[PDB]
Design a protein around this ligand. Structure first.
Ligand SMILES: [O]C(=O)C1=[C]C(N2[C](C3=[C][C]=C([N+](=O)=O)[C]=[C]3)C(C(=O)C3=[C][C]=[C][C]=[C]3)=C([O])C2=O)=[C][C]=C1[O]
Ligand SMILES: [O]C(=O)C1=[C]C(N2[C](C3=[C][C]=C([N+](=O)=O)[C]=[C]3)C(C(=O)C3=[C][C]=[C][C]=[C]3)=C([O])C2=O)=[C][C]=C1[O]
Ligand SMILES: [O]C(=O)C1=[C]C(N2[C](C3=[C][C]=C([N+](=O)=O)[C]=[C]3)C(C(=O)C3=[C][C]=[C][C]=[C]3)=C([O])C2=O)=[C][C]=C1[O]
Ligand SMILES: [O]C(=O)C1=[C]C(N2[C](C3=[C][C]=C([N+](=O)=O)[C]=[C]3)C(C(=O)C3=[C][C]=[C][C]=[C]3)=C([O])C2=O)=[C][C]=C1[O]
Ligand SMILES: [Mg+2]
Ligand SMILES: [Mg+2]
Ligand SMILES: [Mg+2]
Ligand SMILES: [Mg+2]
Lengths: 5, 229, 229, 5, 229, 229, 5, 5
């Protein structure tokens, strides 16, 4: 998955 | 509420204990109780709230993705039933966070940082609802997430330096929204690159209190661009 | 019960889904519901039950140890209050497991393996109650744990080969009980060494279905002996 | 802590 | 030789020091010197020799594979020149090991274990020569490796239990030879499965001195079969 | 020299191949050959030289420390003999680097960055000689290291921003010299803290080309201060 | 690569 | 050991 914060 | 008889300061203290114990459901409950005392949150308290609920919904999301994968490969009612059970709990947590944002935290006043912070949260939790939504309701949740991300972007671009970790994290997440939710990989890529490039061009604005957060998120932008190109 | 309207087979199926999703509270609830259908558990089902509750109580134990450490270093009521909250939940889970063992699972009949398995569980969950108990009640919980471990040892020594993973795991855990609960490090060391040595002497009894489990626990015995000498 | 299973 | 003036016992001692320092070129030189004193090696000394040279040639092989990959993707003389430099050094080490085997270690006498051990080494180092060989010479090195592996298999099948780590490691490596060198993936798969299955069927033959080695290599057989199916 | 017949550009190319193959002895030999062509090194080439020799001497240092520990715990000549063998090779590599610095690289001209870079190398390799030196010669090698570190500090403080990675790395290493070599833990601590604090105060000077290196070394300064306080 | 010992 | 670069 793509990175989120 | 169950936290109504407890002092605000004790709720904050117990949220920090629950964090240390990795008891994130407890931590979220304590911070919800503190929010409901009706006083604005400090920066530290803001981030106790967010880390607590992110961990709760993060575990629900990971469980939902596992069951959803089993379900779609299976194509008995048991996998669907259990996926729906987890999905309902995840929606419940998101609805709890969004109601706290609307009822208590989002305001026409406070730091630019404060309003961006909570508006980013609103976009995020509408995005998590969108990941499990279907049909008539999906594309409405999408619009709600977009409008909250976009209001947050408008403020951050005017009131915060391009290296500010909240501004960067917002753009990282909005960029993921474009890619994974709105099927616009080119808007996702353009935003991630613009955000990274504008951070580099004004790298002199890094703050001694948060530069490690800034550079961490700058790498996450680069990571996603690598994944996407 | 909340699981009363669900088919036994669907409860087992959903326990396996919850395991894959690492939703161990759900998994334990499904397996409690299956146990309450009143049929004996298979070996596989036995180990769905045990892994589910071990993960739930394991997280509670780790949280309790963190808070307890903060508490004893602190020598406001908040740390004690929250430690007591976690402690109460941990005791509740242990009481739930012990009641299922007594009410449904422990019997004067079935495999030697079956009776040893559940008697080991009874010793273990009395040990977890002992870790947080005080005063008048501690030393009683200790006796209950000891008598369940000892009955299990008596059976395993007569009915199971010395490499059987359940026999080995029982002795590993009973050895830890001696050391950490009963303040008898020499009984702990003697049992661990005897168990290891008797496994080596009859190593030819390893089973092709479980030898990896046997050798894993044999190393854990060696690990504890290293830690203790 | 010592190992248990 | 440079080690000719040193006592055999001091050479062994220094090989063990070099192992602890991870100085494997030194370790190999010390063990070559010890071999050249002309006395048979013990089991321990056998495995000091083998681990030393395996680490030296293992590093050369990994370097050769990196350069070879760069070279074939490049399709200036520099990459070829440097790959040829590394290749020459790797061949030199293999020729050194094979000469020690033929001149000193392989004999019509000693343990079955001893002859299998050195014959496995001969097959292995002919295999490493085969990995970099071309044309007229490749298929000859292949035959040499095959005949050494096969003699070792014949002995091990008659003189060693099916769980013996040397017998298992030989078959693991011979199975890889079939797959990677002889372009016979079905012989590779059949040998790995037969070896694993025959180890399980006679699992009672595990030795208390080496069972951890046996079970480790049994998993490596399973690993390769997973990779190959 | 053995590299004398090879084109400078081919030597650089082969150094980069050896780096990719983790063949650091080869890499150092190629870069020594390039240095000996007599042209100044670029920044990239500078750092091919330094990484090559750092890896060679780093392995020798780690081996020396292992043997030295065995030796001092042992209080037969074999451990001392082998430690002396490794020590001689380590001194040989350091003498090779220091001779290249004096004969070719250190000059009264070039970047401030260039002179600081090579003067830091001179201090470092005199420090590695000091780690194994005894008696009459130790305290002389110490003075040589100190004077090279100090000249480098004087230049860096006047010509480079406080976040420059070379300036920071120099101070990190000079601070370690004070602590481990000169038995002045308070000079070590004062320099590390001053360097860190002055980097934070002028954090706006981070460069978009090297800020990741700067912040990495800033954490290493904090790490050492944690270790030392 | 496949495993060898 | 302390960190150097
Ligand atoms: O609230 C504010 O104003 C504010 C808050 C912080 N942070 C960090 C932060 C960064 C971005 C987001 N985001 O949501 O994008 C949230 C929190 C954080 C993190 O854990 C974290 C750091 C790096 C990467 C991911 C997580 C803190 O615990 C914290 O306090 C830093 C500067 C700030 O201005
Ligand atoms: O129930 C039976 O009769 C029975 C059950 C098994 N096992 C294993 C096992 C070993 C010991 C205990 N113990 O409590 O000591 C419990 C479970 C296990 C594990 O996860 C596990 C394996 C190694 C180490 C720790 C955990 C299985 O999932 C499983 O099925 C193996 C042989 C058996 O005979
Ligand atoms: O020489 C003999 O007779 C003899 C030697 C040993 N071993 C092991 C061994 C196993 C297989 C091979 N192989 O080549 O296949 C070589 C060495 C070893 C290993 O490092 C090792 C163990 C597991 C996996 C890979 C490496 C020892 O250091 C050692 O002493 C065990 C039983 C033996 O009988
Ligand atoms: O030569 C110059 O002018 C120059 C060189 C660089 N670097 C980095 C560097 C930093 C400090 C030292 N030091 O010795 O202190 C040496 C090399 C480096 C590293 O590997 C590295 C980076 C972080 C930490 C440790 C190692 C490069 O490969 C490289 O090129 C960055 C800015 C520069 O100005
Ligand atoms: Mg945080
Ligand atoms: Mg299990
Ligand atoms: Mg070995
Ligand atoms: Mg470098």
């Amino acid at each position: 998955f793509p990175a989120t914060v | 509420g169950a936290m109504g008889s407890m002092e605000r300061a004790s709720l904050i203290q117990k949220a920090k204990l629950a964090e240390q114990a990795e008891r994130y459901e407890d931590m979220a409950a304590f911070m919800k109780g503190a929010v409901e005392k009706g006083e604005e949150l400090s920066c530290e308290e803001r981030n106790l709230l967010s880390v607590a609920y992110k961990n709760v919904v993060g575990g629900q999301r990971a469980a939902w993705r596992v069951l959803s994968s089993i379900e779609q490969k299976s194509n008995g009612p048991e996998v669907r039933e259990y996926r729906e059970k987890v999905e309902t709990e995840l929606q419940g947590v998101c609805d709890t966070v969004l109601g706290l944002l609307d009822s208590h935290l989002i305001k026409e006043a406070g730091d630019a940082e404060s309003r961006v912070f909570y508006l980013k949260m609103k976009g995020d939790y509408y995005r998590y609802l969108a990941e499990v939504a279907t049909g008539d309701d999906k594309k409405r949740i999408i619009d709600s997430a977009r409008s909250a991300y976009q209001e947050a972007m408008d403020i951050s671009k005017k009131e915060m330096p391009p290296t500010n970790p909240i501004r960067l994290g917002l753009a990282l997440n909005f960029s993921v929204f474009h890619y994974e939710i709105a099927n616009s990989p080119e808007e996702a890529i353009s935003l991630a690159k613009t955000t990274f490039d504008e951070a580099m061009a004004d790298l002199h604005t890094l703050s001694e209190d948060s530069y490690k957060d800034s550079t961490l998120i700058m790498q996450l932008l680069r990571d996603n661009l690598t994944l996407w190109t």
